[PDB]
Design a protein around this ligand. Structure first.
Ligand code: MA4
Ligand code: TSL
Length: 265
């Protein structure tokens, strides 16, 4: 594989769409690679990680408990609720909702959690509170994946998302236990995690949250590193490409391969 930056360019050429990418040291925030890092991209399902960071902040403040059981109705359910559709009778704890939202990308679980933090506006306010003046959530799960060209709703930038994830995972804005919980949920992703491990060389650590939307929108926020360590945060978004999901996945994997083959930078 070619150098990271060259592979990223090759990916845009082949997809006919824009790619946004940031590679950052998790411990220090050192930016290694940046491509269209200040450009907007639909967050799609990657917003679920930031959502649970806001939830954990509420738990830390004593305004929420991961144990608290939330009971909901069938009418509350939206498209793709693999886990939540199974608990109409017994409900789900806030913590379970976050696990389902992040590890299974359960949309109703995400909406239920979104309500607890004040909806899209409330989550955006939380982002503003931790210093992210760019990322914005405007709509609820399902609608936020529309990805209309030139539409600023429900977007982030690679640089903003990377910095925000770093703040949630390591800045001690969240308690030690909460930081550990947010990390574990990403480590436990069932949608892409197992697959990514099956193609990663031995020794490489992976934690992640993926997303997809209209007009080719695709995204992944991840922690990656050799020696089984979460050394770097890697955020990649794709937008406005007519490519098949398979090829968009292949291109993202290709950028990953370039990182792996040329890690020491
Ligand atoms: O020299 C380094 C490595 O080169 C190859 O590894 C390949 C691997 O066989 C292939 O499956 C993967 O594809 C990339 C799979 C990446 C999956 C997604 C990664 C995510 C993580 C962070 C966010 C975006 C992408 O590339 C590597 C590097 O060439 C060899 O097979 C391996 O034995 C060797 O140790
Ligand atoms: C998160 O990225 C979810 C993506 N797609 C879903 C959505 O809420 O828009 C569906 C329902 C379209 S499906 O899960 O892809």
């Amino acid at each position: 594989s070619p150098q990271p930056l060259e592979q990223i360019k090759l990916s845009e050429s082949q997809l006919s769409g824009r790619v946004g990418m940031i590679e950052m040291d998790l411990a220090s925030g050192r930016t290694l690679t940046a491509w269209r890092a200040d450009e907007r991209f639909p967050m799609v399902s990657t917003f679920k990680v930031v959502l649970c960071g806001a939830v954990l902040a509420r738990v830390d403040a004593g305004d929420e408990q991961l144990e608290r059981k939330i009971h909901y109705r069938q009418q509350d359910l939206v498209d793709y609720s693999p886990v939540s559709e199974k608990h109409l009778a017994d409900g789900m704890t806030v913590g379970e909702l976050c696990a389902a939202a992040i590890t299974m990308s359960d949309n109703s679980a995400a909406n239920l959690l979104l309500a607890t933090v004040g909806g899209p506006a409330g989550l955006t306010a939380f982002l503003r509170q931790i210093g992210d003046n760019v990322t914005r959530l405007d709509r609820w799960a399902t609608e936020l994946n529309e990805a209309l060209p030139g539409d600023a709703r429900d977007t982030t930038t690679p640089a903003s998302m990377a910095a925000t994830l770093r703040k949630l995972l390591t800045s001690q804005r969240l308690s030690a236990r909460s930081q550990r919980q947010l990390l574990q949920w990403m480590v436990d992703d069932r949608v892409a995690g197992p697959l990514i491990r099956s193609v990663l060389p031995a020794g490489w650590f992976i934690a992640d949250k993926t997303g997809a939307g209209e007009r080719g929108a695709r995204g992944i926020v991840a922690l990656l590193g050799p020696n089984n360590k979460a050394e770097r945060i890697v955020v990649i978004y794709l937008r406005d490409t007519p490519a098949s999901m398979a090829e968009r996945n292949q291109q993202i994997a290709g950028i990953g391969a370039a990182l792996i083959e040329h890690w020491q930078r």
